[PDB]
């Protein structure tokens, strides 16, 4: 239609800027990264945003609300993703044997 | 901290079906997920392989967790060579 073609345009053309993530990663490493790191790390974070919004619209469709996304559907989105191990936290030393 | 992903993330939520005009407190949430996702995939990437940040260990975490992040990183590494072959 005429909205699906505009939505497909924003699904492809949108990206995080490489001039800021290279500034963001290098504040964590200390020295330097490469261009093929920033190209991949800018691409995984678009999949991760698409992992949340496609699942936060499943929270909103499950409850009785409309397309505008309140934060109620966004804290619930991170809760359901973390219970399936999708959201990694490297500060919680987990233990499976008890 | 200011918001470094305020205008970029509004295009992306529209790209996955949200609205043309998302709420400010919803982009407040998604901007903090991405900064933690890049932090909790760099803090764990500087212990694997070596104490640097080569991209041969960024591709390790994407398998056995979610195959969409792995099938969309093999496309960005293949298309880097088909966009330098055209020049």
């Amino acid at each position: 239609s005429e909205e699906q073609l505009n939505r497909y345009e924003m699904y492809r053309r949108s990206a995080f800027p490489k001039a800021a993530i290279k500034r963001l990663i290098q504040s964590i490493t200390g020295t330097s990264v490469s261009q093929n790191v920033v190209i991949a790390m800018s691409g995984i974070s678009k999949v991760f945003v698409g992992e949340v919004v496609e699942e936060a619209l499943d929270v909103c469709e499950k409850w009785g609300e409309m397309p505008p996304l309140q934060p109620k559907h966004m804290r619930e989105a991170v809760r359901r993703l973390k219970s399936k191990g999708q959201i990694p936290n490297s500060k919680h030393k987990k233990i499976i044997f008890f | 901290r200011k918001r470094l992903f305020s205008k970029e993330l509004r295009c992306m939520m529209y790209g996955f079906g949200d609205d043309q005009n998302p709420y400010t407190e919803s982009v407040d949430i998604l901007e903090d997920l991405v900064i933690e996702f890049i932090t909790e995939m760099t803090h764990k990437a500087m212990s694997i392989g070596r104490q640097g940040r080569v991209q041969v260990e960024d591709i390790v975490f994407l398998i056995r967790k979610d195959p969409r992040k792995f099938a969309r990183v093999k496309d960005l590494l293949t298309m880097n060579e088909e966009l330098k072959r055209a020049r």
């Binding site: 053309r13 505008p68 934060p71 | 043309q20 005009n21 709420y23 400010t24 407190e25 919803s26």
Partner: peptide, 26 residues
């Protein structure tokens, strides 16, 4: 020179269509 000016035109239309009014929520 063609790659330098056309890169910012994919993002310039990404500030005219999406996000016209800024909302909030209780």
């Amino acid at each position: 020179v063609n790659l330098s000016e056309e890169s910012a035109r994919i993002l310039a239309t990404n500030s005219e269509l999406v996000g016209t009014l800024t909302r909030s929520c209780k």
